[PDB]
């Protein structure tokens, strides 16, 4: 009945390993609104971490889910197939950028998708190594933790994660890492630790999520594409977070001018239901022999119809266009707040994948994690749910549903504005 | 909308890597019945691979899920908590064997569950290695494929999986591997490849699933518990398939006389919805640092209320007792069929985790995979969905819902009988 | 100038990790005789661990070393070549078993030899994995420690050695490991952990050295050759200790009835000078890209002429024949002693690679390591230098120079006799 | 004989993997001169690759070797000890930089030295990972190949070498890598791939050998020392090539104003005889349990006395001072040449570890591997033996024995002078 009472029960029944950003227990929600067990209402700007681009319980999505719930919820596709799985795969084959034929594998979590994307690139190229970028995030399975460019706290006390994962530098001028540096950092790997003939794939987020909402430029992605082409290396675009419309296009790669060989997706693809997948070159996808791709819950029937409905909703409700409008509105509002607060050293973002980075006295060398965390706390006190990110915990991101109403856009910014103001005195 | 038609589309849009045991597209289901897209009815003895111990769309479970769909489907627990996740953890801490304080983490798939249990075991012991058994199955992520005692097809063509996973022999007298050999193979690892101080844990299925439905004796499990104790090794019981009441007790470990340090669960735990978790000795669970455990969909709201309801159903409908009664009825009918078919060299199983193993001319060293495959095919033509298993593909298992009707017990056995009779012709 | 003071100095200058079997400092030696700094004389039955098959400072060898010492000692072959290196390779190409063209590489230590043989096999098959046997010993580099079937003390406290090295069972009837068991253990790796297409080679000692002087039968070696042939796996014969004529033939494989794809050699090859090498099927040896192989001291000029002279000595002095007779005289006297002491549960060996194993009350399950240690200690008190081995340290081995004098043979046996009598007294 | 005839036999008996810089077969050598089988005389400016700082067959060294050759050549220190080994360890413990107690392990090759240094660091810190630098060279065993910052052609076709080796950038202002970049690259590893608590050691060459004769500054070495101190990481200085006086001090670290925890040495330590070793902080060296450190040839008797004699010679003949004088003469000579040849973009070196780097049209971005190779070829025709190096094969190094006469210094410079003039014609 009370948040604290539940937090106490949480401390006795659940390990501390599982962090709790907001010590609040949600009871119900709708679109951009969430009510806790105490009846307090909050404006959701986190969206279950980019999972709710269509909002909490989108009515069209729920109706689809209820219909399937009347038919069946599980059989395990590998044993007995079913249409929602097949249908979504065909739709994904069409929506993911690429003029060649694609095939889609459905799993359940983003971690699984990345895991499987890599397995596939290995079977296709008959190579074992992979390259990932600094500040990257790909999941919490041993292998994805190795791909993830961040050790603490995910691996603390555990020891070293799986080898044969090499680290390249993600391009980021704001912090002195040029596109030439990033590209140079890959050749360095080829020259020092693993030749091209041993690299199955280069995994990259078109727009890093946990890494701080940093976007790759089309130019860079084009260089990366040519580099992979030259070495028979599979380009894996991890769009688990950037995908499903966040950047203004269904997939961020559509704005890069090049197509990846494989793409992983999840989170917002099903608008609040467990589903993930991999879509890529048909022949690369088919490199794995029959029986080598599976998963009990893979492509859960309910989640499949949810995803299918999410995609219809994007089309009928013009969410991509709104995503872009929202991003502009958000960026204009934040640049306005920025004028009165030098700590805001950057307002960026493609589509609605918006973020601001805080710096101690505008020094691009002094990340202000203290201010960042304070703003998140004050925002919560004012009924607004926020999340931070970045390898230094000084980036504030906005992952509010694309279905957000205009008045709620102003409300959220006004609250953010008040937080910075009150953080002065 | 015919099976053949849908299969053609399958080959065009989905990777062949995703095997298809039965070329049938299920449309709807109810308890033990499943109807395909052509309207044909089937008796389900596979159960979505031990995922439906409470049957397809159990009314109580479905009603709980429908109620929760009016509240919320996702927030990501680590950001905004919710009570169903918490409640399930409290209940699992009590239900999982072990007379000491315990804590639970919820994830989404069995693979993730095994992944996390190992991460936890590693953090608690400050060690990196792990020992798994021959014929074991633990998932399809890079690391769990290594734990999995089977390379083909699971990880074929992909190159070698993560090292620092050693292989022990699972006790199996039917095939000349005594418990002494099994215990001896663990010491062999200790002396030849990895000292006890480098082994965080020994992962074992109380009853092997894909491995052939081979059960560990209480005596053996007890020697294993003593061995882990002497060396400070965590005993991880993988109960993703043996759990959720399939053996007559909620968890097979209850029948072993000893408690593991960690236990993984999934599949039947939520009767048709994506959920999994890890329950273990509180001090071991707490070893991971704050923020080190987490996944986007982990402990999904809908899945949780579903799991809670499954637990209530087991109680209200006496499913554990029924599991045992069902198992005895099954083995007896199978033994009656064996009187007329030597090829059946063994009938076995705890509770309702039943299987029979085929041999050419009853020669216990001549796995009869051709016949096994023939029985599955014949069964399908008679409307019965079955699954085989075992390293040599000569084991037929029964994972029909525990909520099976008396008549369906007669029907499935009768069909099987006809299959052997019509094959012997 | 006393052994005691030198040992004290040793404790302050040299790491304890370097063990000292005998706390004696040798000053000079001749053939089978050794004198310590205190002028005491000993009979060497250890031969610097199978390094002095031609005895300490064989005059013909020394004369050759002296002649080369006037010319040059080092240029580094890969930079500026020299004849002794080339000539030795040519001779080894002829001497190593295998009725087909071969090429040879010279390195410096047995460890490097195994390292290179594996590198060569990997380039030749395009595979990364290897299989080695229980109780095997292949060197103390990271990789050769992974290949070695013994963790402590070789790796104690160091953590886990390089992965992708799988363990098979060495055939050993005396301890219940049948040949069928050995072969079956290889297929187990193929099924549970690494498919044949990922195994570049199987490394095996025709006769295990540190492992207990257990020899492989021709029948077994033949099955192994067949198995490797079927899968295109390189068979690597590690003859660093079994080679250089210790078994009656120059290389133990000659007595197996089949040829390995690669053979490693060191120790006795150069009668007490630092040299090692790898000899193998020409096509296989050529797989490595030009400039991929190298080592600074590799094929040291002085060690080469010593090796070339050692081979001449073997032919001119019929050491292969004397090896067999020495072996026979040793076994006879050891069997003689065995009749009075049941502890000696087995006398075995090919050529002069002779050993006896000790058990508590002839109980093949109670390895008498304590008695073994006592015998070594007692023999030392009597002026005889011996060495033990075997995973349980209950194996006494004789590695006395093949050039030993008949009276010394009797002398040696008498001492061993006296040791057993006085121990059991 | 004929060089070419010997080369033909070489191509038939030895694998192409063993490259041949100079297609010449040496017969005799002395100090700085080498005579091939055709009787042709050459001035040696490569020194067997920095193995002959005291020149070919230094008379004092040969005499000691002959004296030991009359006593014994091998017993294997672990079985029976001998004074030469002990004496060398005692002397290295005091000469190797480090104001604290040290212990020394003697092995045989530089590769083995690095292998053991890492093994020791791992046992001492109880961690498994290591960090190495770009362009580094540490040996050709699997593990040292992983430490080595160059894949082709060492690893070609073999697949990926051992994991858990992370790449840092070596400071090299000439090519755009600042010391800040170098240190930053280490923190990048701590943040992205391996936490400090998992890093047992950071391996570095005070002056990179094969990497291009690029030296670390005291300032940088001091920052590195401070970083290691802060995390309890062992700083291993691989002075196999930089050691034994090449830089003007016995070890290059002396000039860094800071001491390493472990130092590996080989090459010139024994002036042309197979010997290598590890000298480091005593408690660290002793972290390995007895029996854990070994090697058959380790600390070969003859090589030990040669090494002890080399040490006396440096003192008696003032080679350290001569190394600095020689370097100054070479650099002055080379600078004069560079006044007429723009392709020479840099003249550098500590003591007598001298090198010049070649660029096309004097552009640091355009390495001239072709000119470099031409100079080597022309130099040889003129009777001068040279070696090149660097990741882009455009670096000419000088490793002539420190015992060279002024006339020969002038002669070598003149020969090099002509090559450039004649290469531009
Ligand atoms: C969220 C995330 C994941 C991991 O997905 P899960 O559904 O939590 O297993 C993978 N990749 C990226 C880019 C992510 O943001
Ligand atoms: C089914 C299974 C798994 C993996 O579960 P998924 O939900 O398919 O990822 C793990 N271990 C065992 C024992 C299983 O049978
Ligand atoms: C002695 C031995 C080695 C290691 O040789 P070293 O010269 O000490 O490196 C390798 N293999 C076997 C079979 C050995 O007995
Ligand atoms: C030469 C070298 C080595 C390898 O030593 P070897 O005697 O060839 O095995 C190791 N480290 C460095 C710095 C070297 O240049």
Put simply, the answer to whether A149 touches D189 (Cβ < 8 Å) is: no
Put simply, the answer to whether D165 touches A193 (Cβ < 8 Å) is: yes
Chain B residues whose CB is inside 8 A of the C194 CB are 151, 160
CB of B32 closer than 8 Å to CB of A58: no
How many whole angstroms separate alpha carbon A213 and alpha carbon B90?
Answer: 37
- Cα D393 to ligand 4 centre (Å): 18
How many whole angstroms separate alpha carbon C394 and alpha carbon C387?
Answer: 10
Joined tokens for residue B212: 């052939």
Residues D10-31, buried b or exposed e (16+ Cβ, 10 A)? beebbbbbbebbbebbbbbbbb
* Residues near C344 by beta carbon (within 8 Å), at least 6 away in sequence: C334, C337, C338, C356, C357, C358, C420
State which H helix or E strand residue B87 sits in. Answer: helix B83-95
Closest alpha carbon to C211 in C163, C177, C256: C177
Pocket probe mutation, ligand 4, options D46, D53, D209, max atoms within 8 Å of Cβ: D209
- Resolution at which this structure was determined, Å: 2.4
**Bond prior to A153 in cis (omega within 30° of 0):** yes
CB of B54 closer than 8 Å to CB of B313: yes
A58-317 has which CATH code? Answer: 3.40.640.10
Chain A residues whose CB is inside 8 A of the B127 CB are 159
How many whole angstroms separate alpha carbon B233 and alpha carbon B124?
Answer: 10
Q: Does domain D1-57+318-425 have CATH number 3.90.1150.10?
A: yes
Joined tokens for residue D398: 């000088």
* Residues present in chain D in total: 425
How many whole angstroms separate alpha carbon D287 and alpha carbon C156?
Answer: 10
Helix (H, G, I), strand (E, B) or coil at D318: coil
* Domain assignments of chain C as residue spans, ordered by start: 1-57+318-425, 58-317
Put simply, the answer to whether D72 touches C26 (Cβ < 8 Å) is: yes
How many whole angstroms separate alpha carbon D72 and alpha carbon C273?
Answer: 10
Kindly give the number of the ligand 4 atom that is closest to the alpha carbon of D112: 9
Joined tokens for residue B2: 């015919």
Residue D9 Cα distances to B342, C93, C269, C280, angstroms: 67, 12, 22, 17
State which H helix or E strand residue C12 sits in. Answer: helix C3-13
Provide φ and ψ at A341, rounded to 5°.
-140, 95
Tell whether A162 is within 8 A of chain D (Cβ): yes
Closest alpha carbon to B301 in B77, B30, B124, B20: B77
* Residues near A155 by beta carbon (within 8 Å), at least 6 away in sequence: A145, A161, B119, B292, D195
How many whole angstroms separate alpha carbon A63 and alpha carbon A70?
Answer: 11
What single string gives the DSSP state of each residue in C251-319? SGGGGTTS--SEEEE-GGGGTSSS-EEEEEEHHHHTTSPTT-B--SSSS-HHHHHHHHHHHHHHHHTTH
Ligand nearest to the CA of B109: 2
| Angle at alpha carbon of residue D370, lines to D365 and D371, rounded to 5° | 90
Residue that has been written with the tokens 């049957």 in this structure: B55
**Bond prior to C230 in cis (omega within 30° of 0):** no
Joined tokens for residue D96: 């190797």
Joined tokens for residue D187: 């923190």
Closest alpha carbon to A21 in B85, B81, B83, B105: B81
Give the pairing of strands C129-133 and C199-204: parallel
Helix (H, G, I), strand (E, B) or coil at C408: helix
Beta strands in C136-178 (DSSP E): 165-168
Residue that has been written with the tokens 């792990």 in this structure: B130
* Residues present in chain C in total: 425
Closest alpha carbon to B16 in A235, A262, A123: A123
Pocket probe mutation, ligand 2, options B106, B110, B147, max atoms within 8 Å of Cβ: B110
Kindly give the number of the ligand 4 atom that is closest to the alpha carbon of D109: 7
Tell whether C176 is within 8 A of chain B (Cβ): no
- Cα A110 to ligand 1 centre (Å): 4
Sheet with C395-398, strands from edge to edge, namely: C344-350, C353-358, C395-398, C387-389
* Residues near B85 by beta carbon (within 8 Å), at least 6 away in sequence: B77, B106, B299, B301, B304
How many whole angstroms separate alpha carbon A330 and alpha carbon A327?
Answer: 5
Provide φ and ψ at D307, rounded to 5°.
-60, -45
Give the pairing of strands A199-204 and A207-208: unpaired
CB of A152 closer than 8 Å to CB of A135: no
Pocket probe mutation, ligand 2, options A296, A297, A303, max atoms within 8 Å of Cβ: A296
- List residues forming the annotated binding site of C: 110-111, 241, 296
* B139 Cβ below 6 A of ligand 2: yes
Joined tokens for residue C278: 């790898």
Residue B411 Cα distances to A273, B31, B32, B385, angstroms: 37, 15, 12, 12
Put simply, the answer to whether B272 touches A73 (Cβ < 8 Å) is: yes
Cα Rg of chain B, angstroms: 21
> Quick one: CA torsion of C294, C300, C303, C309, rounded to 10 degrees?
90
Residues A365-401, buried b or exposed e (16+ Cβ, 10 A)? eebbbebbebbbebbbebebbbbbbbbbbbbbbbbbb
Residue that has been written with the tokens 């072969």 in this structure: C183
- List residues forming the annotated binding site of C for pyridoxal 5'-phosphate: 110-111, 241, 296
Q: For residue C232, count CB atoms less than 10 angstroms from its CB and return exposed for 0-12, middle for 13-18, buried for 19 or more.
A: middle
Residue A129 Cα distances to A193, A281, B76, B158, B162, angstroms: 10, 20, 32, 11, 12
Joined tokens for residue A331: 């960026």
User: Cα dihedral sign for B39, B43, B46, B49?
Assistant: positive
Chain B residues whose CB is inside 8 A of the C160 CB are 128-129, 163-164, 194, 198
Joined tokens for residue C71: 């010319």
Residue that has been written with the tokens 């133990």 in this structure: C252
Pocket probe mutation, ligand 2, options B211, B266, B387, B390, max atoms within 8 Å of Cβ: B266
How many whole angstroms separate alpha carbon A379 and alpha carbon C186?
Answer: 62
Return the residue in C18, C25, C46 with the most chain D beta carbons within 10 A, the one to mutate for interface testing: C18
Closest alpha carbon to B408 in B47, B38, B132, B134: B47
Chain D residues whose CB is inside 8 A of the C18 CB are 77-78, 105, 290, 293-294, 298
How many whole angstroms separate alpha carbon D75 and alpha carbon D94?
Answer: 26
Q: For residue D226, count CB atoms less than 10 angstroms from its CB and return exposed for 0-12, middle for 13-18, buried for 19 or more.
A: exposed
Residue C304 Cα distances to A9, C77, D24, angstroms: 76, 12, 18
> Quick one: CA torsion of A221, A222, A223, A225, rounded to 10 degrees?
90
Element counts in chain D: helices (H) and strands (E): 13, 15
Joined tokens for residue D290: 């007895």
Return the residue in C138, C150, C192, C198 with the most chain B beta carbons within 10 A, the one to mutate for interface testing: C192
* A123 Cβ below 6 A of ligand 1: no
Residue that has been written with the tokens 């599976």 in this structure: A294
How many whole angstroms separate alpha carbon B335 and alpha carbon B231?
Answer: 43
How many whole angstroms separate alpha carbon B366 and alpha carbon A29?
Answer: 59
> Quick one: CA torsion of B146, B151, B154, B158, rounded to 10 degrees?
80
Helix (H, G, I), strand (E, B) or coil at B41: strand
What single string gives the DSSP state of each residue in C21-60? SS--BEEEEEBTEEEETT--EEEESSHHHHT-TT-BT-HH
* Residues near B397 by beta carbon (within 8 Å), at least 6 away in sequence: B213, B353, B354, B355, B386, B387, B388, B389
How many whole angstroms separate alpha carbon A16 and alpha carbon A26?
Answer: 20
How many whole angstroms separate alpha carbon C278 and alpha carbon C105?
Answer: 5
Q: Which chains sit next to A, with 3 or more Cβ pairs under 8 A?
A: B, D
DSSP letter, residue C217: P
Q: For residue C409, count CB atoms less than 10 angstroms from its CB and return exposed for 0-12, middle for 13-18, buried for 19 or more.
A: buried
* B268 Cβ below 6 A of ligand 2: no
User: Cα dihedral sign for A186, A190, A196, A199?
Assistant: negative
Helix (H, G, I), strand (E, B) or coil at B44: strand
CB of A136 closer than 8 Å to CB of A208: yes
* Residues near C408 by beta carbon (within 8 Å), at least 6 away in sequence: C32, C43, C400
Residue D354 Cα distances to C227, D28, D211, D342, angstroms: 54, 26, 13, 18
**What is the distance between the terminal CA atoms of chain A, rounded to a whole angstrom?**
35
**Bond prior to B153 in cis (omega within 30° of 0):** yes
Joined tokens for residue D176: 């755009």
State which H helix or E strand residue A354 sits in. Answer: strand A353-358
How many whole angstroms separate alpha carbon D108 and alpha carbon C266?
Answer: 13
How many whole angstroms separate alpha carbon A166 and alpha carbon A176?
Answer: 21
CB of D306 closer than 8 Å to CB of D272: yes
| Angle at alpha carbon of residue B307, lines to B304 and B312, rounded to 5° | 130
- Cα B137 to ligand 2 centre (Å): 7
Helix (H, G, I), strand (E, B) or coil at B27: strand
Helix (H, G, I), strand (E, B) or coil at D1: coil
CB of B166 closer than 8 Å to CB of B233: no
Joined tokens for residue C228: 């490797």
How many whole angstroms separate alpha carbon A379 and alpha carbon A122?
Answer: 45
Partners of residue D385 on adjacent β-strands? D44
Provide φ and ψ at B226, rounded to 5°.
-65, -40
How many whole angstroms separate alpha carbon A79 and alpha carbon B106?
Answer: 26
Closest alpha carbon to B66 in A28, A59, A69, A84: A69
**What is the distance between the terminal CA atoms of chain B, rounded to a whole angstrom?**
35
Residue D49 Cα distances to C68, C112, D333, angstroms: 20, 19, 22
How many whole angstroms separate alpha carbon B187 and alpha carbon B168?
Answer: 9
CB of D48 closer than 8 Å to CB of D271: no
Sheet with A276-281, strands from edge to edge, namely: A102-107, A276-281, A262-265, A234-238, A199-204, A129-133, A165-168
How many whole angstroms separate alpha carbon D380 and alpha carbon D396?
Answer: 13
Closest alpha carbon to A168 in A193, A144, A151: A193
Closest alpha carbon to A390 in A252, A208, A216, A220: A208
In the structure, which protein residues have their CB atom closer than 6 angstroms to any atom of ligand 3? C 109-111, 114, 137-139, 205, 209, 238, 240-241, 266-267, 276; D 295-297
Chain D residues whose CB is inside 8 A of the C49 CB are 76, 79, 296
* Residues near C124 by beta carbon (within 8 Å), at least 6 away in sequence: C200, C234, C283, C284, C287
Closest alpha carbon to A162 in C164, C141, C131, B238: C164
* Residues present in chain B in total: 425
Provide the H-helix boundaries in A270-358: 282-285, 301-316, 319-340
3-state helix, strand, coil in chain C (%, to 5): 40, 20, 40
Kindly give the number of the ligand 3 atom that is closest to the alpha carbon of D295: 8
Nearest CA to ligand 2 atom 5: B110
Joined tokens for residue D280: 């480091």
How many whole angstroms separate alpha carbon A279 and alpha carbon A238?
Answer: 11
According to the 3-state scheme, what is the secondary structure of D321-377?
Answer: HHHHHHHHHHHHHHHHHHCCCCCEEEEEEECCEEEEEEEHHHCCCCECHHHHHHHHH
3-state helix, strand, coil in chain A (%, to 5): 40, 20, 35
User: Cα dihedral sign for A411, A413, A418, A423?
Assistant: positive
Tell whether A417 is within 8 A of chain B (Cβ): no
How many whole angstroms separate alpha carbon A274 and alpha carbon B297?
Answer: 6
DSSP letter, residue A400: -
Sheet with B22-30, strands from edge to edge, namely: A80-81, B22-30, B33-36, B41-44, B384-385
Beta strands in B7-69 (DSSP E): 22-30, 33-36, 41-44
Partners of residue D18 on adjacent β-strands? C293
Residue D37 Cα distances to A395, D27, D42, D122, D138, angstroms: 71, 5, 12, 47, 32
Put simply, the answer to whether B134 touches C167 (Cβ < 8 Å) is: no
């Amino acid at each position: 009945n009370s948040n604290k009472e539940l937090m106490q029960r949480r401390s006795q029944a659940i390990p501390r390993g599982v962090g709790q950003i907001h010590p609040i227990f949600a009871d119900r929600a709708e679109n951009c609104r969430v009510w806790d067990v105490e009846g307090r209402e909050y404006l959701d700007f986190a969206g279950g971490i980019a999972v709710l681009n269509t909002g909490h319980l989108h009515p069209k999505v729920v109706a689809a889910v209820e219909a399937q719930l009347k038919k069946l919820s599980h059989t395990c596709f590998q044993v007995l197939a079913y249409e929602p799985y097949l249908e979504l795969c065909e739709i994904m084959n069409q929506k993911v950028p690429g003029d060649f034929a694609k095939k889609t594998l459905l799993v359940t979590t983003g971690s699984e998708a990345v895991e499987n994307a890599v397995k596939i690139a290995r079977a296709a190229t008959k190579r074992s190594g992979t390259i990932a970028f600094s500040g990257a995030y790909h999941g919490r399975t041993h292998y994805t933790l190795a791909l993830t460019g961040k050790v603490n706290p995910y691996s603390a006390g555990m020891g070293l994660m799986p080898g044969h994962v090499y680290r390249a530098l993600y391009p980021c001028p704001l912090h002195g890492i040029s596109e030439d540096d990033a590209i140079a950092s890959i050749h360095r790997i080829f020259k020092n630790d693993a030749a091209p003939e041993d690299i199955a794939a280069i995994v990259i987020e078109p727009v890093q999520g946990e890494g701080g909402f940093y976007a790759s430029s089309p130019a860079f992605m084009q260089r990366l594409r040519a580099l992979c082409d030259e070495h028979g290396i599979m380009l894996i675009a991890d769009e688990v977070q950037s995908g499903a419309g966040r950047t203004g296009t269904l997939f961020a790669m559509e704005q890069m001018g090049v197509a990846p060989d494989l793409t992983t997706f999840a989170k917002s693809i099903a608008g609040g239901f467990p589903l993930a997948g991999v879509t890529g070159r048909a022949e690369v996808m088919d490199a794995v022999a029959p029986g080598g791709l599976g998963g009990t819950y893979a492509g859960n029937p309910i989640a499949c119809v949810a995803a299918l409905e999410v995609l219809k909703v994007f089309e009928q409700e013009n969410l991509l266009q709104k995503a872009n409008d929202l991003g502009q509105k958000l960026k204009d509002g934040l640049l306005a707040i920025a004028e009165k607060h030098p700590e805001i050293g950057d307002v960026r973002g493609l589509g609605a994948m918006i973020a601001i980075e805080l710096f101690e006295d505008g020094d691009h060398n002094k990340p202000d994690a203290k201010l960042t965390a304070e703003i998140v706390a004050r925002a919560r006190d004012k009924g607004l749910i926020l999340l931070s990110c970045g390898p230094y915990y000084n980036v504030l991101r906005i992952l509010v549903p694309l279905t957000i109403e205009d008045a709620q856009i102003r409300q959220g910014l006004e609250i953010i504005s008040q937080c910075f103001d009150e953080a002065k005195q």
